[PDB]
Amino acid sequence: QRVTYRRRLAYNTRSNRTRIIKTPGNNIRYLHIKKLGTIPRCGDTGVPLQGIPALRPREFARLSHNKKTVQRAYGGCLSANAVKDRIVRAFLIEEQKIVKQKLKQL
Template sequence: MGVRVTYRRRTSYNTRSNKIRKVKTPGGRVVVQYPNKKTSASTCADSNLNVVLNGLKRIRPTKLKQLSRRQRTVSRPYGGVLSAGALKNRIIRAFLVEEVKIVKQIKK
């Protein structure tokens, strides 16, 4: 649609936060709609793993705050922050570190 429309918000620049969509109303007018920004999936906080976290909604941060705790996280330690694999690795690493400490004590 090559129809000229006016922005409904403050800025009149085509920025990332000010994208518009032209829509024809049933009355025949062409108006501006502001689509929501695309959301990216939450990823694992472990720096070397770039894994998408399962069980979490792809939602904007402001909307995420409005959800209940049950919907924001996964019921597991570090749920919603670390992936299951990353958590497993951390647990195993912590266990092995403790084992090494015990072995060193026995050797003394």
């Protein structure tokens, strides 16, 4: 059967996304589904982080703290490799500065 849109927002667009379902009354119906969520992305590299559910921005508030962050430094903001790269670079830079200061003082 030909089905019409539930709303009156003519000229269906990106927002107008529907799904066809069969009701217990044996009727085919348009069900408007909101856009899928987006998983957070790493700040340094940009790959989506691991262990964070892919949900909507407004929805993220409902989650608990542990479900939005990872138990590590910069957890929920930087990937594990990015954290590793950040840590080793900082230490090598500090050592490069400590030897440079040692060379200048002698």
